[PDB]
Every structure is written in C-alpha cells, then in structure tokens.
Amino acid sequence: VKIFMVRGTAIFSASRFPTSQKFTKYVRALNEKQAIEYIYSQLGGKNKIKRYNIHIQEIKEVKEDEITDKTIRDLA
RNA sequence: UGCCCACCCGGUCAUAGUGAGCGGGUAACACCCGGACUCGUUUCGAACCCGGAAGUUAAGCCGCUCACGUCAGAGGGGCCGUGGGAUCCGAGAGGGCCCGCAGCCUCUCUGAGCUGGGAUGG
Secondary structure (H helix, E strand, O other): OOOOEEEEEOOOOOOOOOOOOOOOEEEEEOOOOHHHHEEEEEHHOOOOOOOOOOEEEEEEEHHHHHHOOHHHHHHH
C-alpha cells in the first residue's frame, strides 16, 4: 500500500512550523498523485487554505514498522 | 637612454581629506639674507614689493606608516516598497496571490589618487 510521508508549507500570515501541531500531517496512499490530492483535500477546507500558499517541501515513503504514531499503525 | 620623481600650467573635484609619526633633498622647491632704489605697511621690509642669497630637510613641499573622515567590494544585521489584473479574502481598514522591478539603513572584513601640457633631478 506504500504509506507516504508528507511535509509541506501552507500559510495564512506565516503559518510555518515544521513540527507536529500547526504545520503538517501524515498520509496513507498508493502513489504520489493520489497522496498529493489528500493534503489539498483536507488543508484546503479544514482551515481555509488555498492551494496558492501550499508548498510541499518533502514527500517520501516511510517503512511500515517504524512510525511514531500507533493510531496510524493499528488501522492496518 | 629611459621613464617616473618632484616643479610650473592643468583636468578629475575627497577613493584624491584631515591629524599624528617617520623618511627624502647639496638639482628642483621652499625655508632662509637684506631692503638704498620700485612698491608698501590707516605701526612695522611682519606681510606685500624689490635686491637677493649664507645656511638648511627642522617647517612647508614630498613619500611612507597609523588613525579617523570618504568611495566602493563582500559579509552580517536593520527595515521595507511599487507598477500590472481579477464579481479573490476581509464589512472596512487591510492582506495574500499570480505578471515586472527594486532599493534603504547599520556593523564586519578588503581596497583606496587619477590624468593632459612643458623646463629641473634619477
């Protein structure tokens, strides 16, 4: 299923915080194209953030046996 | 030779400045000698004007060193605009975004006199 790792920049009045409660998320998806939609899907409406100020910095794949979160883990 | 080294005549008008220290002169340049005549000091040969010319690199001049002033280069930091467009956001004030441009201050480091025309000196 190839779990993905997303870390990108979105802004209203400098909402950059490359850490984990006001800036970025995790994703489970097949490929980049499906994955890249999801961040648009959520951050686009959940906080009124246009894809203008969306700037994906790092996108990659994590291995299935090491993620700091168990909630994303057990759902398999 | 030579050319630069000063000088006279300059242009550039501080990157070329100011201040201090030091170095260079037997020519050049001044300092410096003396005033009867020229001229002249609301006193003075101070200065100017004339006649000079012993001494002398201490002045100045010149070069160099260091400071500051000052032009740039780079770095750090400070601060931040404006054209072009939308039934875009925001009630407004305002702001983002796509199309074009930037500059501003302040510290650090690095450079910092160029050049035309003629008579001396090497």
